[PDB]
Amino acid sequence: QVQLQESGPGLVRPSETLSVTCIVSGGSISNYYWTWIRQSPGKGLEWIGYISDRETTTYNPSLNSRAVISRDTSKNQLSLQLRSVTTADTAIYFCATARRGQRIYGVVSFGEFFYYYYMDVWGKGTAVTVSSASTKGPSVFPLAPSSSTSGGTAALGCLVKDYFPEPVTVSWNSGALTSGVHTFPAVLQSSGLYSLSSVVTVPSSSLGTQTYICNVNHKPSNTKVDKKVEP
Amino acid sequence: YVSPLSVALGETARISCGRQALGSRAVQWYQHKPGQAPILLIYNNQDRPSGIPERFSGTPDINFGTTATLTISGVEVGDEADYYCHMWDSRSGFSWSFGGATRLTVLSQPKAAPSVTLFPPSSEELQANKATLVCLISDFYPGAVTVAWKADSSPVKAGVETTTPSKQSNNKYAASSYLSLTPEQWKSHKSYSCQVTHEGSTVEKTVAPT
Amino acid sequence: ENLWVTVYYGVPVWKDAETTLFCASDAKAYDTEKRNVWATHCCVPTDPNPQEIVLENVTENFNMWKNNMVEQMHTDIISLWDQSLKPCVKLTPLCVTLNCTDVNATNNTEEIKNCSFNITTELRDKKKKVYALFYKLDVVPIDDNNSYRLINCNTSAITQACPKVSFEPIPIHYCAPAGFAILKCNDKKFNGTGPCKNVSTVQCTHGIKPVVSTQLLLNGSLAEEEIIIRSENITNNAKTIIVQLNESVEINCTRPNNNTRKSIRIGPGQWFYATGDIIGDIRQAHCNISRTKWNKTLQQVAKKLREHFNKTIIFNPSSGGDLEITTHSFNCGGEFFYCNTSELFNSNNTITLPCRIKQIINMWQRVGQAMYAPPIEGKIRCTSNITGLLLTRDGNNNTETFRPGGGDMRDNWRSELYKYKVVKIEPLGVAPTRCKRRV
Ligand SMILES: *[C@@H]1O[C@H](CO)[C@@H](O[C@@H]2O[C@H](CO)[C@@H](O[C@@H]3O[C@H](CO[C@H]4O[C@H](CO)[C@@H](O)[C@H](O[C@H]5O[C@H](CO)[C@@H](O)[C@H](O)[C@@H]5O)[C@@H]4O)[C@@H](O)[C@H](O[C@H]4O[C@H](CO)[C@@H](O)[C@H](O)[C@@H]4O)[C@@H]3O)[C@H](O)[C@H]2NC(C)=O)[C@H](O)[C@H]1NC(C)=O
Ligand SMILES: *[C@@H]1O[C@H](CO)[C@@H](O[C@@H]2O[C@H](CO)[C@@H](O[C@@H]3O[C@H](CO)[C@@H](O)[C@H](O[C@H]4O[C@H](CO)[C@@H](O)[C@H](O)[C@@H]4O)[C@@H]3O)[C@H](O)[C@H]2NC(C)=O)[C@H](O)[C@H]1NC(C)=O
Ligand SMILES: *[C@@H]1O[C@H](CO)[C@@H](O[C@@H]2O[C@H](CO)[C@@H](O)[C@H](O)[C@H]2NC(C)=O)[C@H](O)[C@H]1NC(C)=O
Ligand SMILES: *[C@@H]1O[C@H](CO)[C@@H](O)[C@H](O)[C@H]1NC(C)=O
Ligand SMILES: *[C@@H]1O[C@H](CO)[C@@H](O)[C@H](O)[C@H]1NC(C)=O
Ligand SMILES: *[C@@H]1O[C@H](CO)[C@@H](O)[C@H](O)[C@H]1NC(C)=O
């Protein structure tokens, strides 16, 4: 019954304050615990800190010097600030609702129990790169149909040329066409700029003109590019 | 860092938890696909949240000495992901780190031939005084390919940029190769060909200037 | 009219005396584990069936507090303990400086300590660094927590108890020699001292278990009908107060820790038994008694206490003495428990007592030879019957306060030797009859 939604910058300069925000829809933020986990590339995922229902924080000893987690009461949202970020802090930042269980192995009066936390509901996750390099808008050039296989099918697409940083979200006809769509992984060029391709397999009877437009969005650069494709 | 596990398709698999406990314990088991949200399979050693199937299960510590193992029955293509074993015991303090990742790999999957599509540089890119031949490779397994480019007979070997294969929602792999040229270099040659070798087989697609 | 003395030999006449009584124990097997300290290498087997002869019309004055059987048993138990410890391994070279750290647990208190130290090897020239766990009571910091010695090493030498000899009390019957006899008070409501109307004689006593215990008494015999309050002098606060229950309260004592024994050789044939690392959870020892049964027991005690002093009767914990007097100390399965009875004397939701453990011990206030109780493998659990109490007055007639005490171990022997008394027969009688011998 609970849905989390991470929002964040995508890019942050080194030696700055990284901020991310996690919008909760399902319930109250002062009933369950909340926590942040990050997945930096080429490393296993790291639990960085949690915030209670009571507004009491606890941080991982490695990042405790640099981290602060907060809970907004009016908005069902929780933030994570991280001061003096570096190249290492580049990661996919997930938020998740944590649940405190107590494991009791003997008598309660003596102690003989320990608290444990487990994160049942996760958010989708927000990618965050840390780099001195500036933001670049993607150049969108349309890939024409070759006119490709034996009928019905033929292939067209859209090229998203060098941009920075990841990610780019691509849809077709403002998400009207879902059949045949396949957006590929981007390539990091020696330039230091990512480039991807998105392609749609449509029948050669449908072409044409069905007026196929690809809708590109790059949230760091704030550039929404709609481009027609045609033989 | 990650430890590799290999399992035949349809056979049951048991995932050993690193750092096994010193006292009574309440482990968690997290399934994590690369790029996607982690999903916990087990929160208390036996218990699974609603919606997780009955295939996954973890060992209770009814009698001390038992070792934490995540048991997956009927292993399928979709089960292939990273598994983390979060460990909490009575003796050790606050467990901050999750367990070392366990890379499950599902063996004996059906091999798929690569669907290559070579696109010539777009008219509007040539208008910008640049050219990139785009060779897109989809729906292939195992995800291991070597891309070689050709101008006529001669191999290009320069301005070649290629992504390592990454999985798609089909559970097959998808890779793309980019060959940057000048518009004049694109026009100079007769045709250009993208050779994609998948295992023994090699698929070639050829495109020429109109 | 002419009366003459006439000698009668074997008249039933006796006088109060004190003689050397001897041990008697029923023929128990003891085959896989044997030679407990009270049976020893040899004790005399009892009669297949001992005879108790009711002495009709006899009224005899008893005194449990001036009883000599108590003083003999006390000196017997002490001597027996020394005979058992003599051949065992002595841990004089275990007084090296100890490098100690706390054991792994959740940060809520740490009694238990993991201690590394050099020890002499089987070779004289060579030395070994070993580790062992010790309880906080056994050790004291020589300077800092960085390193520690054993508590005893400054005061006196130490000796390990042999792992074969068991601390389990067994029934022991005390017997008198020929020409003497034991008189048993058969009276149900028998006070400590005074005349006993219903008396019997026996050659040997009932099976008394030598249960070493403090504050509350364990596995005794229960007083029939009404609970009996015994004291040497009720108005004197210095003398303790024996209580004997009629309905037994039961006590459940466990050490949940699954300890391990580590045989480290400290020597030519010398094997010191250390505590290895604990397996599983860190749970401290405890004892449970039923809140309903205890509160009923303590109720009935206050009623029969008011027969003497008669007025407010209060119970408080022990405020005087060492760690061994203040807590309810006893043995359970080999380990020596020291239980905090402040819960009980402060007047099924069972009342739980915090029990600490000590391995180095000096019982009967013994100064000099200290004993190392070897660690016991696995989880410990015992279940005992609480039959009596040992109380003490603070020392008025406005409010009375009774604290538990174990000022003398003799009290425990008294609690079962109340009903017995030693006498010597004087079989020569002379009396007048009209009978003269041949001239
Ligand atoms: C403990 O202490 C007590 C008290 O001091 C002692 O009890 C006394 O014992 C003496 C004997 O040693 C008794 O004196 C004798 O009394 C009998 C009793 O009379 C008989 O006749 C009646 C029948 O109508 C009846 O009253 C009696 O019944 C009782 O006795 C029977 C025994 O069969 C018994 O089963 C019952 O329980 C009854 O209680 C009984 O039938 C009397 O017969 C005696 O005279 C004979 O013996 C003497 C010599 O001993 C002799 O001189 C006579 O010529 C005659 O042959 C004798 O007077 C006395 O009654 C008891 N009670 C007292 C004094 O109060 C006892 O000795 C001690 N016990 C022990 C075990 O040591
Ligand atoms: C335990 O059990 C018995 C229960 O009777 C008890 O033994 C005797 O008790 C009394 C009282 O402690 C002691 O003697 C008495 O002392 C008082 C006070 O001085 C006197 O008033 C008594 O006189 C009575 O007896 C006279 C006899 O001629 C009669 O004239 C008349 O009946 C008087 O009331 C009496 O002297 C006595 O010393 C003890 N002990 C013994 C061995 O007899 C005992 O006290 C109880 N309690 C304890 C703590 O032991
Ligand atoms: C004290 O008196 C009691 C009862 O008056 C006696 O107990 C009896 O002892 C005989 C053995 O000689 C048994 O056969 C009976 O069963 C006992 N009676 C009861 C009621 O149980 C005995 O003379 C004395 N007590 C003891 C312990 O010997
Ligand atoms: C034990 O003896 C060695 C020398 O053999 C010494 O280096 C060490 O300091 C001793 N151990 C401790 C805890 O002092
Ligand atoms: C032994 O004692 C020293 C203090 O001098 C301490 O630094 C060291 O950690 C101890 N060694 C061990 C193994 O406990
Ligand atoms: C009994 O108690 C009082 C002390 O309260 C004392 O004066 C008296 O002499 C004592 N008598 C005996 C026999 O202990």
Q: What is the DSSP string of A111-176?
A: --EEEEEEEEEE---EEEEE-SSPPBPPPEEEE------SSSEEEEEEEEEEEBSS--EEEETTTT
Task: Say if residues C36 and C77 touch (Cβ distance below 8 Å).
Answer: no
Q: Under an 8 A CB cutoff, do B90 and C107 touch?
A: no
Rounded to whole angstroms, the Cα distance separating A23 from A2 reads: 10
Task: Say if residues A143 and B134 touch (Cβ distance below 8 Å).
Answer: yes
List the single best residue of C282, C349, C353 to mutate versus A (max A Cβ within 10 A): C282
CB atoms within 10 A of CB B149: 22
Which of A103, A139, A157 lies closest to B24 in CB terms? A103
Q: DSSP characters for A108-122?
A: TTT--EEEEEEEEEE
User: Where does residue B67 rank: exposed (0-12), middle (13-18), buried (19+ CB within 10 A)?
Assistant: exposed
Rounded to whole angstroms, the Cα distance separating C337 from C216 reads: 13
Query: Dihedral through CA C299, CA C300, CA C301, CA C307, nearest 10?
Result: 120
Rounded to whole angstroms, the Cα distance separating C72 from C91 reads: 30
Task: Say if residues C399 and C311 touch (Cβ distance below 8 Å).
Answer: yes
- Extract the tokens encoding A139: 């150049």
If you ran DSSP here, which 8-state letter would residue C234 be given?
T
Rounded to whole angstroms, the Cα distance separating A229 from A146 reads: 12
A-B contacts (CB, under 8 Å): 119
- Please tell me if the CB atom of residue C63 comes closer than 6 angstroms to any atom of ligand 6: no
Which stretch of DSSP H or E encloses residue C294? helix C291-305
Greatest Cα pair distance, chain B, in angstroms, is 77
Rounded to whole angstroms, the Cα distance separating A118 from A99 reads: 5
Which of C60, C190, C191 to probe ligand 2 with, by most ligand atoms within 8 A of CB?
Answer: C191
Task: Say if residues C60 and C421 touch (Cβ distance below 8 Å).
Answer: yes
**Where does residue A84 fall: left (phi above 0), alpha (psi -120 to 50 degrees), or beta otherwise?**
left
Q: To which residue do tokens 């769509």 refer? A: A181
Nearest residue on chain B to C282, alpha-carbon basis: B91
Side-chain-side CA neighbours of residue B129 (13 Å): 0
Q: What value does the CA radius of gyration of chain B take, rounded to a whole number of Å?
A: 24
Residues 6+ apart with CB under 8 A from B81: B31, B32, B33, B34, B104
Residue type, A123: G
Q: Under an 8 A CB cutoff, do B24 and C281 touch?
A: yes
User: Where does residue C278 rank: exposed (0-12), middle (13-18), buried (19+ CB within 10 A)?
Assistant: buried
- Extract the tokens encoding C352: 């739980």
Rounded to whole angstroms, the Cα distance separating C335 from C329 reads: 11
- Extract the tokens encoding C284: 């401290």
CB atoms within 10 A of CB B87: 22
Q: Under an 8 A CB cutoff, do A46 and B97 touch?
A: yes
Rounded to whole angstroms, the Cα distance separating C87 from C375 reads: 19
Among candidates A81, A90, A84, A68, which has minimal Cα distance to A14?
A84
Q: Under an 8 A CB cutoff, do C352 and A107 touch?
A: yes
Nearest-CA distance from A182 to chain B in Å? 9
Nearest-CA distance from A133 to chain B in Å? 21
Helix %, strand %, coil % of chain A (to 5): 0, 50, 50
Residues 6+ apart with CB under 8 A from C273: C160, C163, C261, C262, C263, C374, C375
Rounded to whole angstroms, the Cα distance separating B148 from B158 reads: 11
- Please tell me if the CB atom of residue C65 comes closer than 6 angstroms to any atom of ligand 2: no
What CATH class does B109-210 carry?
mainly beta
Which of B44, B98, B166 lies closest to A45 in CB terms? B98
- Extract the tokens encoding C5: 């003395």
Which subunits have 3 or more CB–CB pairs within 8 Å of chain C? Answer: A, B
Residues 6+ apart with CB under 8 A from A197: A143, A157, A158, A159, A160, A183, A184, B119, B134, B136, B176
Which numbered atom of ligand 1 lies nearest the CA of C57? 1
Q: To which residue do tokens 């026009």 refer? A: B187
Task: Say if residues C301 and C315 touch (Cβ distance below 8 Å).
Answer: no
Query: DSSP alpha helices (H): ranges in C65-155?
Result: 68-85, 152-155
Q: DSSP characters for C367-402?
A: -S-EEE-PPPSEEEEEEEEEEEEEEEE----SEEEE
- Extract the tokens encoding A164: 């920075």
- Please tell me if the CB atom of residue C186 comes closer than 6 angstroms to any atom of ligand 3: yes
User: Looking at beta carbons, which pairs linking C271-277 to residues 24 or more positions away fall under 8 Å?
Assistant: C271/C89, C272/C89, C272/C91, C272/C94, C272/C119, C272/C160, C273/C160, C273/C163, C273/C374, C273/C375, C274/C130, C274/C132, C274/C133, C274/C375, C275/C132, C275/C133, C275/C134, C275/C359, C275/C375, C276/C132, C276/C133, C277/C114, C277/C133
- Which residue's C-alpha comes closest to atom 13 of ligand 2? C194
Which subunits have 3 or more CB–CB pairs within 8 Å of chain B? Answer: A, C
Which stretch of DSSP H or E encloses residue C241? strand C241-259
Rounded to whole angstroms, the Cα distance separating C59 from C53 reads: 14
Among candidates C101, C164, C162, which has minimal Cα distance to C132?
C101
Which of C100, C117, C118 to probe ligand 4 with, by most ligand atoms within 8 A of CB?
Answer: C118
| Nearest-5° Cα angle at A125, A121 to A129 | 155
3-state secondary structure chain B: CCEEEEEECCCCEEEECCCCCCCCECCEEEEECCCCCCEEEECECCECCCCCCCCEEECCCCCCCCCCEEEECCCCHHHCCEEEEECCECCCCCCCCCCCCEEEEEECCCCECCEEEEECCCHHHHHCCCEEEEEEEEEEECCCEEEEEEECCEECCCCEEECCCEECCCCCEEEEEEEEECHHHHHHCCCEEEEEEECCEEEEEEECCC
Q: Is the link from the previous residue into A201 a cis peptide, with omega within 30 of 0? A: no
φ and ψ at residue C226, rounded to 5 degrees: -90, 150
CB atoms within 10 A of CB C213: 25
Cα–ligand 2 centroid distance for C67 (angstroms)? 20
Which of C96, C129, C130 to probe ligand 4 with, by most ligand atoms within 8 A of CB?
Answer: C129
Residue type, C123: L
Nearest-CA distance from B186 to chain A in Å? 16
Q: What value does the CA radius of gyration of chain A take, rounded to a whole number of Å?
A: 23
Q: To which residue do tokens 């303090």 refer? A: B93
Q: Under an 8 A CB cutoff, do C352 and A109 touch?
A: yes
Task: Say if residues C240 and C65 touch (Cβ distance below 8 Å).
Answer: no
CB atoms within 10 A of CB A107: 16
Q: Which domains does chain A have, with CATH numbers?
A: 1-132 (no CATH), 133-231 (2.60.40.10)
Q: Under an 8 A CB cutoff, do B90 and C281 touch?
A: yes
A115 touching C (Cβ < 8 Å): no
Among candidates B132, B136, B131, which has minimal Cα distance to B118?
B136
Which of C235, C240, C400 to probe ligand 6 with, by most ligand atoms within 8 A of CB?
Answer: C235
Q: What b/e readout covers C258-270, taking b as 16+ CB neighbours within 10 angstroms?
A: ebeebebebbeee
Contacts of B90 in chain C (CB under 8 A): 105-106, 281-282
Task: Say if residues A131 and A165 touch (Cβ distance below 8 Å).
Answer: yes
Among candidates C421, C392, C357, which has minimal Cα distance to C63?
C421
Task: Say if residues C294 and C352 touch (Cβ distance below 8 Å).
Answer: no
Q: DSSP characters for A174-185?
A: TTT--TTEEEPP
Q: Under an 8 A CB cutoff, do A199 and B136 touch?
A: yes
Paired strand residues for C113:
C102, C134
Among candidates B199, B135, B145, which has minimal Cα distance to B173?
B145
Residues 6+ apart with CB under 8 A from A120: A96, A97, A99, B40, B43, B49
Contacts of B25 in chain A (CB under 8 A): 103
Return the residues preceding each gap in chain A, C–N over 2.5 A, or none: 147
If you ran DSSP here, which 8-state letter would residue C90 be given?
B
Task: Say if residues B44 and B26 touch (Cβ distance below 8 Å).
Answer: yes
Cα–ligand 2 centroid distance for C231 (angstroms)? 14
Start-to-end CA distance of chain A, whole Å, equals: 47
Q: What value does the CA radius of gyration of chain C take, rounded to a whole number of Å?
A: 26
Do B109-210 and B1-108 fall under one CATH topology?
A: yes
Q: Under an 8 A CB cutoff, do A182 and B35 touch?
A: no
Rounded to whole angstroms, the Cα distance separating C188 from C174 reads: 22
Point out the ligand nearest to the CA of residue C12: 1
Q: To which residue do tokens 């970020």 refer? A: A85
A-C contacts (CB, under 8 Å): 19
Start-to-end CA distance of chain B, whole Å, equals: 51
Among candidates C79, C84, C70, which has minimal Cα distance to C34?
C84
Experimental method: X-ray
If you ran DSSP here, which 8-state letter would residue A89 be given?
G
Dihedral angle sign, alpha carbons of residues B186, B188, B191, B192: negative
- Given the candidates 3.20.20.140, 2.60.40.10, 3.40.50.11900, 1.10.540.10, the CATH classification of the domain at B1-108 is 2.60.40.10
A108 touching C (Cβ < 8 Å): no
Point out the ligand nearest to the CA of residue C187: 3
Nearest-CA distance from B21 to chain C in Å? 9
Nearest-CA distance from A111 to chain C in Å? 7
Rounded to whole angstroms, the Cα distance separating C322 from C345 reads: 18
Rounded to whole angstroms, the Cα distance separating C252 from C289 reads: 7
Contacts of A116 in chain C (CB under 8 A): none
Task: Say if residues C219 and C209 touch (Cβ distance below 8 Å).
Answer: yes
Rounded to whole angstroms, the Cα distance separating A188 from A164 reads: 9
Among candidates C318, C358, C362, which has minimal Cα distance to C340?
C318
Q: Under an 8 A CB cutoff, do B91 and C107 touch?
A: no
- In chain B, domain spans: 1-108, 109-210
Which stretch of DSSP H or E encloses residue A50? strand A46-51
If you ran DSSP here, which 8-state letter would residue C43 be given?
-
Which stretch of DSSP H or E encloses residue C230? strand C228-231
Task: Say if residues C351 and C296 touch (Cβ distance below 8 Å).
Answer: no
Rounded to whole angstroms, the Cα distance separating A88 from A151 reads: 50
